[PDB]
Design a protein around this ligand. Structure first.
Ligand SMILES: [Mg+2]
Ligand SMILES: [Mg+2]
Ligand SMILES: [Mg+2]
Ligand SMILES: [Mg+2]
Ligand SMILES: [Mg+2]
Ligand SMILES: [Mg+2]
Ligand SMILES: [Mg+2]
Ligand SMILES: [Mg+2]
Ligand SMILES: [Mg+2]
Ligand SMILES: [Mg+2]
Ligand SMILES: [Mg+2]
Ligand SMILES: [Mg+2]
Ligand SMILES: [Mg+2]
Ligand SMILES: [Mg+2]
Ligand SMILES: [Mg+2]
Ligand SMILES: [Mg+2]
Ligand SMILES: [Mg+2]
Ligand SMILES: [Mg+2]
Ligand SMILES: [Mg+2]
Ligand SMILES: [Mg+2]
Lengths: 177, 67, 82, 95, 116
RNA sequence: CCUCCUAAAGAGUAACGGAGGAGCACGAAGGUUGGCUAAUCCUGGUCGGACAUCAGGAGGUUAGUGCAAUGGCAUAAGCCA
RNA sequence: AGGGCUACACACGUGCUACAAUGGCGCAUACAAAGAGAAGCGACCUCGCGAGAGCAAGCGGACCUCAUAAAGUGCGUCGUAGUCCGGAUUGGAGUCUGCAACUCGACUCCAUGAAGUCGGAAUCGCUAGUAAUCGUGGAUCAGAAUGCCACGGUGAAUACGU
């Protein structure tokens, strides 16, 4: 809750002033975080996909869903229904917790940093972001690794405009370039 | 939250270099000794420069010292 | 490269005729066979057309071109491929 | 059969190159195991000449021929090597 | 055994192990393990967190990894944009320091491209 | 043997007229209860590319229906337990 | 005067260095021969991580200087890894020769750390202080050897036979 707490007094009240939100309800809050990691190399061997699953379960604290192709595509030689990736939605206590971790452990282990981008926003205000390796999280143990592997990390928000979001992020001292 | 399908998720302690210590919930299952927290980091702190370009003329006048 | 103690080498002829360029402001290109001569700071701003063996070729001098030797900007062989 | 051409007092054009290569392609039917082979063309005053040397599987075969042209020289040469190559083969397939 | 944001072998003599850092050779390795008064024959696995840090400190004195890789890449970009003879050697991918190309020179040029 | 047109707004209606299918498949792909909503484009995002999986928006059935065509289908006859 | 003979899709010949443990690295410590030097060989001392720099004894030389042989040997370490194997390539920073080292020198330090795991068909050298392997010198020469011509160290294998 650290940052849920921080959010509930420090963040809300700053943003409160700098936009002149009359209603408090108007203040952007963070809704949910979701961690995709597609694993096309599944159609080759299915063990790989489950091996991802444990990673994403080890990072995040909860079992991932296993996603399947919506339609068949011949481009990648897949057919509708084969498992090809896995996600976790994070919503509460756990969502704020992982977030805390992301900022204050994971992201300053990025092999050579320059912050993150502040360009990656959808236009409504939901921050999307990749990670090249998965050693970034100390949840995993680097000498017990099969492969280098990545994920998306998408922070879905109640922000209305692209801009208004950025503020919400920054106000948690989010490391933008 | 469903029962007995998810991994253990517990308190630990995460001691940086700069003495910085933070109780945190994680699977990892034992206390960490990490080396660069969000306080110990060039970028967050404000350190990293951007590589000094445009030295050729400074170089040359430093190198030779000739009228 | 040339010892540091002996200073940077420039042919005198060319050294002189980039006082008149820099003092008595002109704006012409200068002919030269002086591929030896290193580029001095004074030379910044002045095109100077250095010989490559058969032709002179223009080198609009810049900050980045300082210390290098003219001829390092006049290629002397032609090759397109085989 | 890897080929090599020289010219000692002759410019190897792209008839004389193309021509010589075709004429030499026959020789492999006389003995399958030819390796690298070097050809030399000469003009001394009025005499057109052509010698080649042929590294083969356990040997070295050489001949030279004189024509009134270089084509006629090379024509002559190919007849000389043919006979030598056959002789070689037959004193290996000697059963 | 994490220095300069890379994992260092922990079963190798410090001297040997520290070399895995890009931008430290062997001279630097020796220095580090004396500037930060740490023995040479000591394996990294048998150290103290404390020892590993004073060590972490020494390495910061140099320009290494990411940082270095950037510096190099600037220097080469610099040359190519200048268009100097040395620049083009880098473009066309050819021996930049005067070596013969009529033969050999296969490290720049890479393996052979046959004819026809 | 099935579907559309010719067929003249009920049914039916010929030609060696114009176009296409069938000679099965399913113990679930049947029964019921509970729940669910498509195509496609755009924006952002590790490998990841015009196209895989993730997030948002526009869209509103342009999807879907074990297999032809026609008529149906949201209370879905479509999708999941 | 400047450039070219040093160009590079490629083919062939002669070499060097490797691919490791009969070996790499660090410390310690033995035993040669032959040859060169005059405005040349240049000690000792001081400086420098180093290439080198400054100062300046001796020697036309069985006397002085080049100029400490190396493999070997002992002690330690690496433990069969594309590695503490290899050292190509490239960036940065220097030194020296020379009116001058961009095209196009040799060398030094820091960093980089490629191909290569013993080589298809073919094919070469050598019968004893030989091959193999290890160092040393000279001619040319301002500077520029993996080539050439010389010199020692260690030191095999096998010849039934035609
Ligand atoms: Mg004939
Ligand atoms: Mg080195
Ligand atoms: Mg009717
Ligand atoms: Mg009717
Ligand atoms: Mg009728
Ligand atoms: Mg009919
Ligand atoms: Mg049905
Ligand atoms: Mg129902
Ligand atoms: Mg996409
Ligand atoms: Mg959507
Ligand atoms: Mg439709
Ligand atoms: Mg039904
Ligand atoms: Mg001349
Ligand atoms: Mg020549
Ligand atoms: Mg050899
Ligand atoms: Mg080595
Ligand atoms: Mg001499
Ligand atoms: Mg000293
Ligand atoms: Mg004999
Ligand atoms: Mg030798």
């Amino acid at each position: 809750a650290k940052l849920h707490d921080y959010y509930k007094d420090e963040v809300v009240k700053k943003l409160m002033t700098e936009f002149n939100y009359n209603s408090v309800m108007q203040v952007p809050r963070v809704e949910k975080i979701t961690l995709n990691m597609g694993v096309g190399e599944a159609i080759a061997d299915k063990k790989l996909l489950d091996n991802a699953a444990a990673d994403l379960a080890a990072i995040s604290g909860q079992k991932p869903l296993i996603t399947k192709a919506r339609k068949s595509v011949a481009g990648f030689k897949i057919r509708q229904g084969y498992p090809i990736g896995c996600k976790v939605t994070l919503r509460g206590e756990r969502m704020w917790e992982f977030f805390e971790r992301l900022i204050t452990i994971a992201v300053p282990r990025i092999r050579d940093f320059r912050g993150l981008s502040a360009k990656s926003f959808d236009g409504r205000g939901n921050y999307s972001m990749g990670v090249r390796e998965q050693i970034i999280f100390p949840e995993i143990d680097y000498d017990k690794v099969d492969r280098v592997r990545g994920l998306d990390i998408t922070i879905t928000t109640t922000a209305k405009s692209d801009e208004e979001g950025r503020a919400l992020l920054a106000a948690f001292d989010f490391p933008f370039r | 939250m469903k029962k007995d399908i998810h991994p253990k998720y517990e308190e630990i302690t995460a001691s940086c270099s700069c003495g910085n210590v933070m109780k945190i919930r994680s699977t990892v299952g034992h206390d960490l000794n990490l080396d660069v927290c969000s306080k110990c980091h060039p970028f967050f702190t404000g350190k990293q420069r951007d590589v000094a370009t445009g030295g050729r003329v400074d170089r040359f006048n430093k190198r030779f010292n000739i009228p | 490269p040339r010892s540091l103690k002996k200073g940077p080498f420039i042919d005198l002829h060319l050294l002189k005729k980039v006082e008149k360029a820099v003092e008595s402001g002109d704006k012409k290109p200068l002919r030269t066979w002086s591929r030896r001569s290193t580029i001095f700071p004074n030379m910044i701003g002045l095109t100077i057309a250095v010989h490559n063996g058969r032709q002179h070729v223009p080198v609009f001098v810049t900050d980045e071109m300082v210390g290098h030797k003219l001829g390092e900007f006049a290629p002397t062989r032609t090759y397109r491929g085989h | 059969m890897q080929l090599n051409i020289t010219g000692n007092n002759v410019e190897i054009t792209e008839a004389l190159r193309e021509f010589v290569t075709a004429k030499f392609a026959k020789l492999e039917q006389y003995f399958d195991r030819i390796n690298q082979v070097y050809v030399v063309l000469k003009v001394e005053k009025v005499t057109h000449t052509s010698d080649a040397t042929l590294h083969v599987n356990g040997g070295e075969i050489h001949a030279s021929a004189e024509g009134q042209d270089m084509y006629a020289a090379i024509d002559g040469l190919i007849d000389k090597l043919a006979r030598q190559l056959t002789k070689h083969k037959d004193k290996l397939k000697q059963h | 055994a994490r220095i300069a944001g890379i994992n260092i072998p922990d079963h190798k003599h410090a001297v040997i192990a520290l070399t895995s850092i890009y931008g430290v050779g062997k001279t630097r390795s020796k220095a580090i393990l004396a500037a930060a008064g740490i023995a040479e024959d000591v394996k990294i696995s048998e150290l103290s967190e404390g020892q590993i840090d004073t060590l972490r400190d020494e390495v910061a004195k140099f320009v290494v990894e990411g940082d270095l890789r950037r510096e190099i890449s600037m220097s080469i970009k610099r040359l190519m944009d200048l268009g100097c003879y040395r620049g083009l050697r880098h473009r066309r991918g050819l021996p930049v320091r005067g070596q013969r190309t009529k033969t050999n020179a296969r490290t720049r040029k890479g393996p052979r491209k046959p004819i026809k």
